[PDB]
Design an enzyme around this catalytic site. Structure first.
Site, PDB file in Angstrom:
ATOM      1  N   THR A 192      -3.347  -5.144   7.162  1.00 65.42           N
ATOM      2  CA  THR A 192      -4.274  -6.332   7.611  1.00 65.42           C
ATOM      3  C   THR A 192      -4.631  -6.327   8.806  1.00 65.42           C
ATOM      4  O   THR A 192      -4.051  -5.803   9.838  1.00 65.42           O
ATOM      5  CB  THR A 192      -3.227  -7.488   7.454  1.00 65.42           C
ATOM      6  OG1 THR A 192      -3.029  -7.765   6.024  1.00 65.42           O
ATOM      7  CG2 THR A 192      -3.745  -8.860   8.140  1.00 65.42           C
ATOM      8  N   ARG A 200      -8.039  -6.324   2.116  1.00 62.20           N
ATOM      9  CA  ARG A 200      -7.032  -5.166   1.392  1.00 62.20           C
ATOM     10  C   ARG A 200      -5.479  -5.603   1.433  1.00 62.20           C
ATOM     11  O   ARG A 200      -4.816  -5.931   2.530  1.00 62.20           O
ATOM     12  CB  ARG A 200      -7.342  -3.704   2.136  1.00 62.20           C
ATOM     13  CG  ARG A 200      -6.327  -2.797   1.710  1.00 62.20           C
ATOM     14  CD  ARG A 200      -6.621  -1.522   2.374  1.00 62.20           C
ATOM     15  NE  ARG A 200      -7.765  -0.799   2.010  1.00 62.20           N
ATOM     16  CZ  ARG A 200      -8.215   0.142   2.687  1.00 62.20           C
ATOM     17  NH1 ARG A 200      -7.540   1.031   3.303  1.00 62.20           N
ATOM     18  NH2 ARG A 200      -9.301   0.760   2.065  1.00 62.20           N
ATOM     19  N   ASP A 208      -9.752  -9.241   6.870  1.00 63.20           N
ATOM     20  CA  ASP A 208     -10.029  -8.305   5.812  1.00 63.20           C
ATOM     21  C   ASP A 208      -9.216  -8.633   4.643  1.00 63.20           C
ATOM     22  O   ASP A 208      -8.716  -9.615   4.338  1.00 63.20           O
ATOM     23  CB  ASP A 208      -9.641  -6.677   6.213  1.00 63.20           C
ATOM     24  CG  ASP A 208      -8.077  -6.468   5.963  1.00 63.20           C
ATOM     25  OD1 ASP A 208      -7.170  -7.183   6.323  1.00 63.20           O
ATOM     26  OD2 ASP A 208      -7.834  -5.760   5.390  1.00 63.20           O
ATOM     27  N   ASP A 221      -8.351   1.286  10.742  1.00 58.38           N
ATOM     28  CA  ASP A 221      -7.014   1.238  10.156  1.00 58.38           C
ATOM     29  C   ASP A 221      -6.931   1.433   8.799  1.00 58.38           C
ATOM     30  O   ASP A 221      -7.867   0.718   7.940  1.00 58.38           O
ATOM     31  CB  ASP A 221      -6.535  -0.367  10.599  1.00 58.38           C
ATOM     32  CG  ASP A 221      -5.244  -0.618  10.150  1.00 58.38           C
ATOM     33  OD1 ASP A 221      -4.293   0.377  10.014  1.00 58.38           O
ATOM     34  OD2 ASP A 221      -4.917  -1.784   9.631  1.00 58.38           O
ATOM     35  N   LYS A 232      -6.863 -13.660   2.413  1.00 58.46           N
ATOM     36  CA  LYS A 232      -5.708 -13.758   3.374  1.00 58.46           C
ATOM     37  C   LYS A 232      -6.098 -15.218   4.256  1.00 58.46           C
ATOM     38  O   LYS A 232      -4.905 -15.466   4.883  1.00 58.46           O
ATOM     39  CB  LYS A 232      -5.609 -12.627   4.291  1.00 58.46           C
ATOM     40  CG  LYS A 232      -5.344 -11.440   3.546  1.00 58.46           C
ATOM     41  CD  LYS A 232      -5.231 -10.143   4.507  1.00 58.46           C
ATOM     42  CE  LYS A 232      -5.222  -8.929   3.636  1.00 58.46           C
ATOM     43  NZ  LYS A 232      -5.221  -7.680   4.616  1.00 58.46           N
ATOM     44  N   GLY A 236       1.873  -9.217   7.474  1.00 56.32           N
ATOM     45  CA  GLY A 236       3.429  -9.041   7.175  1.00 56.32           C
ATOM     46  C   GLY A 236       3.556  -9.215   5.801  1.00 56.32           C
ATOM     47  O   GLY A 236       3.001  -8.679   4.919  1.00 56.32           O
ATOM     48  N   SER A 243      -1.692  -4.513  11.342  1.00 58.51           N
ATOM     49  CA  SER A 243      -1.871  -3.383  11.810  1.00 58.51           C
ATOM     50  C   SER A 243      -2.913  -2.793  12.251  1.00 58.51           C
ATOM     51  O   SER A 243      -3.131  -2.011  12.991  1.00 58.51           O
ATOM     52  CB  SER A 243      -1.629  -2.574  10.295  1.00 58.51           C
ATOM     53  OG  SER A 243      -2.681  -2.722   9.405  1.00 58.51           O
ATOM     54  N   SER A 264      -6.059  -1.829   6.416  1.00 56.78           N
ATOM     55  CA  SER A 264      -7.149  -2.539   6.451  1.00 56.78           C
ATOM     56  C   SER A 264      -8.603  -2.023   5.610  1.00 56.78           C
ATOM     57  O   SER A 264      -8.523  -0.713   5.734  1.00 56.78           O
ATOM     58  CB  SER A 264      -7.513  -3.198   7.697  1.00 56.78           C
ATOM     59  OG  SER A 264      -6.406  -3.780   8.439  1.00 56.78           O
TER      60      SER A 264
END
Ligand SMILES: [Mg+2]
Ligand SMILES: [Mg+2]
Ligand SMILES: [Mg+2]
Ligand SMILES: [Mg+2]
Ligand SMILES: [Mg+2]
Lengths: 196, 212, 195, 204, 230, 233, 222, 125, 195, 196
Positions: E5, E23, E21, E170, E37, E51, E133, E173
């Site tokens: 995330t 994913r 994002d 990342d 999200k 998380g 992340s 993500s």
């Protein structure tokens, strides 16, 4: 974290850095560690951010309910409520709190509550990871009954050194001045205190 | 893995499955679990794939050096003991090996040695090694006779691997058959378990529990 | 305890259970009957942790006997097996779970069919033509997969069972001191006293 | 030891043109030992279909629990539960066991009886909803299924074309998993007819 | 903690914007390529979660439910500080075991607000925040381009640019950018798939099978209808 | 097997049209104690190569001596030591990479992450990474430690692929590097304000800049931030 | 405690044709949730018409390839410039790997080329040197996503001829190099969608009697 | 202390009447008129805002209340009883439905829950 | 391996050793001979860790055969047992010790006496009238303590040995697949082929 | 332990406390932590007493053999020999050494060698458990080119504070002055430095 509270002629001043870290990552570089539990009773928080926020919120609630019934609480009373929470829940808490307040009868007072939940009334107190590096400096430079300007300089210089050596401390130096005149917030930026 | 080897009137039957797994993941269905040591000697693969491959082709090199020096075919006893003495030197280091060294010589006749990475060396008539060994033993023990024909012995070995392939999750893919004679081993083909199961079910009447 | 086998043939269910009881170093008994009659046409065999096995079996027995008296009616094998499954599924998330695996062999008088249910200590139920618990299946299932027919007689079932026990006695390291064999059919439950 | 891979098995669901498909293998095992080749992992409550992979005792328990709950739902609501609503019920039910969860991988499939819209959804063991437009996968060969579905799938497949796509996705995924296989079932679901097909596959 | 995330929150002139994002991952495998999200606590209070995905969803719905009942009880529109207080006290009580890391943003009669909250129950105030992340990649963009007195258009641009940094840099993500803009005196505008920079290219081959390719043992009609009359 | 005691944080770097840039701060940390404030972590080798090192400082000083010895050794019986047979960035890297992988293979690693930046004889840019595990890789932008998480995303916005390199000037590249160092100072708790920066250009050679400082910092917005939720004063 | 191993991600794929072979691999290099490089070559031309990739821990991967390339050089020195056949290379790599049996190269190795009859050849190795000639083999992170697809589309597994209903298998007809490359590209496109460590770029090395050719394709960079 | 009234206060009289329910209905009869009408494309509910004093701000007293976004309620009888029932009705729409099914309850089922609460005050101690 | 017994009677030493070889789950062999002839009048039986047992036994055998050839003389049972003890005592402080327990049954031709020596893997030697290793002694020693006489015939020794094996077969949990029995006397070594 | 070395106009001075503890027991209250490795090259030792004594003895041997062959070694050379031993044997040593020396060419020099075996040339250095408490004080009060009397006062005040806060430090303050004039030992007792 580098935090301190210092009594002086007209009352007491609380000081703090603004850095919060998760390991080596600075999760917040502009944190406010000086928290209000009553009009003229504030505290500096160190240890678990979750724990110290939870404790402070409960204390603020207790002193609000105290005030509705019995009028303005003393700084000693506020320190006692902090201690009760810290001591009784010592197994489940990581909290190091300095309590500072201004009465008209008692004037400026400082209480420190370290990890174990003991209470210690002091002329001034230092705490947090950065405090270790300024025990020498603060002991040599503290005087009783300093002026407002001298106390601001003492805290500014002290936290400057704590920030310089402690990687867990940094950002801006925040201060809150507690006197009969009222409540004054101060802020000092890196370009100011780094050249001291 | 399921591997077996048994002695009979016509020599030795060697039968193995073909599946290799890493946890639940099926890495290969086309693994070769019979190591062709030389034209007269066979070894089976169980435990560590590399350990079995490496040290049993090494064994082939030692067997070749023996017959160059002594001008005579190496005995199954001597060949198996070269391997067991070697792995015994490494005992504790973490080699993983469970194999049958199979051969047919003049002085010995058909001979099988079970060799193990903890140093065990056992001569015997029937051996079965792997995660599906117990299933194959059942079919072997109840149908084995010394006076089996080469045809019936080959089928018994095939059928015993099929039993294990069905029940053991870590056995399957295909069945490899070998027949070891005094003049050397003879390969008897690769048999897909998928096609073999249905074929056997119909022709034999077995596996009534499974709908086909 | 150790080996418990079950096979459902044409008109009956046969349960075979070992006789040994071992307290670590010594074999304390060689004639133990690892089974309880839950109702006239339903038999349960069991294996698992000491004490818990008999405690669980007798607890189930008491409950089914209570139902039988209250309703003046015998529950179907399917109904009994579902009750037993729930009790084990309840037990697995308890403070101290029953470490007990069971086979339930019953003759359904309504459908005129034998029925065999395999349930482990987690509450994992399956209806099978033949079943086992522990390592017993590893030695016997390849023989049962080969010879089993749904139209077998009771005598043919016993013969296939003998072959399974013989393979167990050959390849198993432990001496389980033979098996007690019981048959469940339309006439009820009976023990084969020579096996 | 790992509760989600003791028994083995897989479920996959896909959407097509005015249709959904849900499929599963038939294996139940005790680690390496194959125990049953008739353990179906897809259930239905009215026109809503639920596949469940993972620990088999929890698969059985949750089926019995959702039969229980959808039966009471119907008696009170005077109508059959819809896929969207049932998805929320599965999520709620799983999350109530947040710190002692059922070790499962549920998959919902169905067509909304009023809108006619095809619907699929997936969950982790703790209730988090994955509502994909294309496909949902679950079980010990979920990696293999993701690989198959990602390449084989295309949108708006006709019922009989979707059958081939989902069947081939399941079969080849199961054949690369030791703990999946031993038979397979495919449901092809249209607004008022459902066809169930048992597939022929290798039995190792 | 479930890794993945990129989410951000950015204050501007007359409100606040959050972005994320799309994913969601289970280990190294992408479970959903277009996850949502951005969660709604109330019409004008939205939060984004990193998380444990079930925990972020569950804790948002619970507080959102209690916020709605509180709003009805008090005849007042919900405040962000109420959502914050209720979230933190719930999370603190569970001592981090509910793995919800949230950025909470919104507008209410008091004004516009932006907070972060961490699984153990600590909260923070800021003009720009990032979580997940990909928070370091996002924060790098925020620290490079953030200024005081951003416009609505500048804040949306900055927020999405910060999410893109997470998407590209990342591994936790990817896929798309979702945005929600909460302006004072206006309806909150949820912009689902605001950016779509990761559409899969056409495959080289069609994998549609000939009909009858799969071997079938049995066919049967499944009765989904209730017991019939007559 | 050991543990790093005195450590250095991020090293960041990127390619541009005519060469490479590399930078690293001047701090030697002792856990959370910011112990040593004048540590040079960029070490030039000749006039064509700069080796940037993070991680254990004692091991950095050992590597520094190895490179110094390498220059001495190359000059032995070498009339073209300052011409055709001078040390190349590719020679220096391969040597370090060999050492790093050998040391990890004996279970006694040099506890570092290293970036070798330079320009080859033919004018080609050289930028490659190696660490305590002997892992090596190349990219238009490279960074160690925190820099990998925060600098790379920013530097990759300037040079996102190979074709962006000829379009990137030294002014744009240095600007991007300097900004990244500021971002790291904001967000890395083991970073310092003071850093060094080196440019290796195929035309203007090696430019080594010492005593640089992070400037143009935004802190004013901190004055409005109060409490952690509900506090107004 | 010091961990001498690491995981650099990556996914590789080898397919053997009738008179050709391909060895493909993505160009992304990673640690944990970070990208080290979007283009770090992983498949190498080792001379003598052999291509190789050692996927997993890149330091061990680079060390093995380097030592094998060196082994090819010394094979020429010691045996009068004789061409190292693919089967001989495979046996040699087994010994390189098994030499470190008790401190292994943490990689999954695949080599490709042509055998001595000119037919396509692929060999596959485990970390400690067990090997086998194969027709089709994926390695690394997304190997579990790719292999089932290849079983179905290369070997026609579970596919039967329409009308016969499971009685007649789909015949195993030979694939052209253009056909194989299509399947490789779709394998990596699918893997890129569902695996976080797969992306950025795809580099394919094609081996024929004419030599070694390279093809590069973009993959999604998220 | 402790609530020591654990027995029913509503009981059957010899004639089969539940006195307290009848008397509750009498209180409803004294209450201000309210009504409801159902149309093909909607429903209307209405009542009189009987202001107790002209100094009172009758807008602050809501006789018509939102229960869910698609459900509303009005009453006749004792206002304070209505107010607490609206609080319970709002909460039960969430606890026994929305937190389970992720959607608001249908009208008939919310009515069923409110009815249950009112039934229990007729039998509980 | 498992059970090894020894008994010294009037004029001979009798060694009884189990036939089973078990690889964890399965019994791989039921005819294994856990003994080696060290010299014409000296026999050694052995039990312990797999591989090490046979490796140690054959190593001892080779050494004693070498001595016999070099000196053209058979070492006394006492001398052989002392050599074996030293090798095990040396082994226990090695990098990887031999995990092997042995019984040495020999007939001393000089003294015209049978001799039985019990040595464990530590190098703990004792001369006994009867002995065992592992758990074998726990089941058998109470019977041997009761019936044993120093003037027993070989036939009486075999009968007492049968009683010991019967008690083992009753109370031991493991199936050791019977025993191979060998007799060592003035004429050398011979195997009892029906037991 | 509290140890430091400070360069000044005429050379360098080494300072140290005299406490050595085994847990909370003071095993020696009059320890000499200022050790001579050459005539005008001394060192302050912290960490394992066994390790630092072993290292110092080996260094003294090396510099004695150096002097017999090549004449007086530089302070840099002495620091290098210390580093070589500390770095190469880092796995088996716990030693934190400050090296201080006087040349006529280079004058006063200070090198600190922390745990890892790195070398750092500094104007002054502090080390030992007590040093943490005087980072602030020393940074604020150090000046370059101080007089002998000023440097003695700086060290005396600094180690006074380190002793005050650190339980592992205490006893007497020992000092060794290194100049062109020679080698002078100083000692300061508790009654003197505690009242500062
Ligand atoms: Mg050998
Ligand atoms: Mg199988
Ligand atoms: Mg990404
Ligand atoms: Mg003994
Ligand atoms: Mg002291």
């Amino acid at each position: 974290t580098s935090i301190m509270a210092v009594t002086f002629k007209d009352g007491v001043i609380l000081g703090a850095d603004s850095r919060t870290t998760t390991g080596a990552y600075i999760a917040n570089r502009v944190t406010d560690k000086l928290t209000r539990v009553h009009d003229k009773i504030w505290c500096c928080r160190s240890g678990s951010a979750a724990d110290t926020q939870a404790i402070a919120d409960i204390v603020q609630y207790h002193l609000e309910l105290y005030t509705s019934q019995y009028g303005t609480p003393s700084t000693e009373t506020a320190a006692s409520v902090f201690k009760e929470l810290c001591y009784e829940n010592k197994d489940n808490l990581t909290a190091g709190i300095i309590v500072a307040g201004y009465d008209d009868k008692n004037k400026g007072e400082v209480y420190t509550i370290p990890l174990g939940g003991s209470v210690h009334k002091l002329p001034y107190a230092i705490a947090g990871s950065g405090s270790t590096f300024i025990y020498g400096y603060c002991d040599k430079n503290f005087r009783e009954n300093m002026s407002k300007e001298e106390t601001v300089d003492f805290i500014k210089h002290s936290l400057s050194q704590a920030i310089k050596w402690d990687g867990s401390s940094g950002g801006v130096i925040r201060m809150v001045v507690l006197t009969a005149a009222g409540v004054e917030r101060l802020i000092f930026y890196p370009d100011e205190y780094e050249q001291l | 893995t399921t591997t077996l080897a048994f002695r009979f009137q016509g020599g030795i039957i060697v039968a193995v499955d073909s599946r290799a797994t890493a946890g639940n993941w099926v890495a290969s269905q086309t693994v070769k679990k019979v190591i062709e040591i030389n034209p007269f000697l066979l070894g089976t693969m169980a435990g560590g794939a590399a350990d079995c491959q490496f040290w049993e082709t090494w064994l082939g090199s030692q067997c070749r050096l023996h017959e160059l020096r002594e001008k005579e075919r190496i005995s199954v006893a001597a060949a198996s003991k070269i391997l067991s003495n070697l792995v015994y030197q490494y005992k504790g280091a973490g080699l993983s090996m469970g194999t049958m060294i199979c051969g047919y010589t003049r002085k010995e006749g058909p001979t099988i040695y079970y060799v193990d990475s903890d140093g065990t060396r056992l001569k015997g008539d029937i051996f079965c090694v792997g995660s599906g060994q117990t299933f194959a033993y059942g079919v072997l023990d109840s149908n084995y006779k010394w006076d089996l024909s080469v045809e019936d012995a080959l089928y018994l070995g095939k059928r015993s691997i099929l039993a294990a392939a069905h029940r053991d999750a870590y056995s399957g893919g295909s069945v490899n058959l070998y027949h070891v004679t005094e003049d050397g081993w003879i390969y008897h083909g690769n048999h897909d378990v998928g096609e073999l199961f249905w074929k056997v079910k119909e022709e034999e009447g077995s596996f009534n529990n499974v709908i086909g | 305890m150790d080996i418990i086998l079950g096979i459902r043939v044409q008109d009956s269910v046969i349960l075979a259970s070992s006789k040994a009881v071992t307290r670590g170093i010594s074999v304390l008994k060689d004639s133990d009957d690892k089974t309880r009659q839950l109702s006239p046409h339903t038999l349960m065999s069991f294996a698992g942790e000491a004490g818990d096995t008999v405690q669980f079996a007798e607890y189930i027995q008491a409950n089914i006997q209570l139902y039988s008296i209250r309703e003046d009616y015998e529950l179907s094998p399917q109904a009994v097996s579902s009750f037993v499954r729930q009790e084990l599924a309840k037990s697995i998330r308890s403070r101290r779970p029953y470490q007990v695996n069971v086979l339930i062999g019953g003759y359904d008088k309504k459908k005129n069919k034998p029925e065999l249910y395999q349930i482990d200590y987690l509450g994992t139920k399956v209806e099978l033509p033949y079943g086992a618990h522990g390592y017993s299946g590893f030695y016997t299932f390849s023989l049962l997969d080969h010879h089993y027919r749904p139209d077998m007689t009771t005598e043919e079932g016993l013969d296939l069972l003998k072959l399974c026990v013989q393979e167990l006695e050959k390849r198993m390291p432990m001496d389980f001191k033979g098996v007690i064999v019981k048959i469940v059919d339309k006439d009820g439950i009976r023990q084969v006293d020579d096996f | 030891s790992d509760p989600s891979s003791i028994n083995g098995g897989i479920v996959v669901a896909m959407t097509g043109k005015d249709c959904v498909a849900i499929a599963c293998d038939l294996r139940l095992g005790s680690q390496s030992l194959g125990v049953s080749n008739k353990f179906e992992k897809i259930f239905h409550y009215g026109h809503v279909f639920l596949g469940i992979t993972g620990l088999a005792t929890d698969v059985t328990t949750l089926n019995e629990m959702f039969r229980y709950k959808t039966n009471l739902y119907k008696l009170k609501e005077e109508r059959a539960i819809e896929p969207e609503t049932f998805t929320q019920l599965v999520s709620s039910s799983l999350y109530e066991r947040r710190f002692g969860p059922y070790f499962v991988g549920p998959v919902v499939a169905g067509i909304n009886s009023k809108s006619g819209k095809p619907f699929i959804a997936g969950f982790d063991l703790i209730g988090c909803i994955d509502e994909a437009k294309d496909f949902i996968v679950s079980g010990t060969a979920s990696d293999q299924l993701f690989g198959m579905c990602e390449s084989l799938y295309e949108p708006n497949l006709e019922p009989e074309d979707l059958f081939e796509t989902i069947s081939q996705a399941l079969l080849n995924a199961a054949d690369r998993d030791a703990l999946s296989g031993w038979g397979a079932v495919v449901y092809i679901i249209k607004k008022d007819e459902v066809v169930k097909r048992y597939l022929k596959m290798r039995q190792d | 903690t479930s890794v993945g995330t990129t989410i951000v929150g950015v204050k501007f002139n007359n409100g606040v914007v959050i972005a994320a994002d799309t994913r969601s991952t289970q280990g190294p495998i992408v479970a959903d390529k277009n996850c949502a999200k951005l969660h709604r606590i109330s019409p004008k209070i939205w939060c984004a979660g990193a998380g444990t995905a079930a925990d972020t969803e569950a804790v948002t719905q619970l507080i959102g439910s209690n916020i709605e009942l509180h709003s009805l009880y008090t005849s007042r529109e919900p405040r962000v500080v109420s959502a914050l207080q209720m979230l933190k006290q719930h999370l603190f009580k569970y001592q981090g075991h509910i793995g919800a890391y949230l950025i909470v943003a919104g507008v209410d009669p008091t004004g516009s607000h932006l907070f972060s909250i961490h699984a153990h129950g600590s909260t923070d105030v800021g003009y720009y925040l990032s979580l997940g992340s990909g928070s370091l990649a996002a924060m790098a963009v925020l620290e490079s381009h953030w200024k005081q007195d951003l416009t609505k258009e500048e804040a949306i641009k900055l927020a999405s640019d910060a999410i893109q940094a997470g998407i590209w840099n990342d591994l936790g993500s990817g896929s798309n950018v979702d945005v929600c803009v909460m302006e004072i005196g206006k309806d909150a505008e949820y912009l689902r798939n605001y950016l779509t920079p990761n559409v899969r290219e056409e495959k080289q081959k069609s994998y549609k099978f000939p009909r009858g390719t799969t071997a079938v043992l049995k066919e049967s009609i499944v009765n989904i209808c209730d017991i019939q009359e007559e | 097997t050991q543990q790093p005691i005195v450590t250095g944080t991020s090293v960041i770097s990127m390619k541009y049209d005519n060469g490479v840039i590399i930078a690293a701060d001047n701090l030697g940390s002792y856990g959370s104690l910011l112990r040593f404030n004048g540590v040079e972590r960029l070490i030039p080798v000749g006039d064509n190569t700069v080796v940037g090192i993070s991680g254990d400082i004692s091991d950095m000083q050992h590597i520094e001596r190895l490179l110094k010895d390498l220059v001495t050794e190359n000059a032995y019986d070498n009339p073209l030591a300052d011409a055709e047979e001078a040390l190349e960035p590719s020679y220096i890297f391969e040597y370090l990479a060999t050492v790093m992988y050998q040391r990890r293979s004996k279970m006694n690693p040099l506890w570092n992450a290293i970036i070798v930046a330079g320009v080859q004889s033919n004018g080609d840019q050289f930028l490659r990474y190696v660490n305590l595990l002997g892992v090596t890789y190349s990219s238009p932008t490279l960074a160690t430690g925190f820099g990998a998480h925060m600098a790379n995303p920013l530097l990759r916005k300037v040079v996102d692929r190979e074709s962006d390199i000829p379009k990137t000037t030294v002014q744009v590249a240095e600007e991007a590097i300097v900004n990244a160092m500021r971002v790291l100072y904001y967000r890395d708790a083991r970073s310092s304000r003071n850093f060094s920066l080196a440019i290796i250009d195929k035309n203007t050679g090696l430019t080594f800049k010492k005593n640089l400082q992070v400037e143009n910092m935004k802190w004013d917005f901190a004055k409005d931030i109060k409490g952690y939720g509900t506090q107004k004063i | 405690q010091f961990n001498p191993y690491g995981d650099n991600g990556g996914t590789i794929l080898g397919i053997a044709g009738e008179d050709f072979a391909v060895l493909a691999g993505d160009t992304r290099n990673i640690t944990d949730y970070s990208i080290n490089s979007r283009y770090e070559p992983k498949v190498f031309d080792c001379g003598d018409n052999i291509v190789m990739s050692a996927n997993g821990f890149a330091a061990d991967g680079d060390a093995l390839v380097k030592r094998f390339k060196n082994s090819v050089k010394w094979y020429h020195f010691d045996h009068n410039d004789k061409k190292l056949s693919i089967n001989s290379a495979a046996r040699n790599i087994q010994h390189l790997l098994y030499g470190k049996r008790f401190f292994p190269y943490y990689v999954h190795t695949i080599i490709a080329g042509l055998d001595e009859d000119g037919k396509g050849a692929v060999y596959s190795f485990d970390p400690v040197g067990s090997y086998e000639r194969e027709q089709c083999r994926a390695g690394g992170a997304a190997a579990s996503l790719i292999m089932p697809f290849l079983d179905n589309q290369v070997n026609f597994k579970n596919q039967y001829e329409p009308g016969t209903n499971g009685k007649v298998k789909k015949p195993l007809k030979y694939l052209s190099v253009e056909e194989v490359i299509k399947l490789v590209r779709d394998s990596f496109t699918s893997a890129t969608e569902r695996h976080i460590q797969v992306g950025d770029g795809l580099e394919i090395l094609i081996v024929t009697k004419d030599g070694v050719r390279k093809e590069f394709y973009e993959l999604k960079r998220d | 202390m402790t609530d020591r009234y654990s027995f029913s206060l509503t009981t059957f009289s010899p004639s089969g009447k539940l006195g307290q329910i009848d008397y509750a209905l009498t209180a409803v009869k004294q209450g201000v008129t309210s009504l409801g009408i159902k149309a093909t494309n909607g429903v209307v509910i209405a009542t009189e805002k009987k202001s107790s004093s002209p100094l009172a701000m009758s807008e602050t007293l809501s006789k018509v209340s939102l229960l869910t976004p698609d459900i509303g309620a009005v009453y006749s009888g004792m206002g304070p009883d209505y107010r607490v029932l609206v609080d319970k009705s709002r909460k039960v729409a969430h606890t026994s439905y929305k937190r389970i099914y992720g959607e608001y309850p249908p009208t008939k089922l919310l009515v069923s829950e409110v009815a249950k609460i009112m039934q229990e005050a007729t039998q509980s101690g």
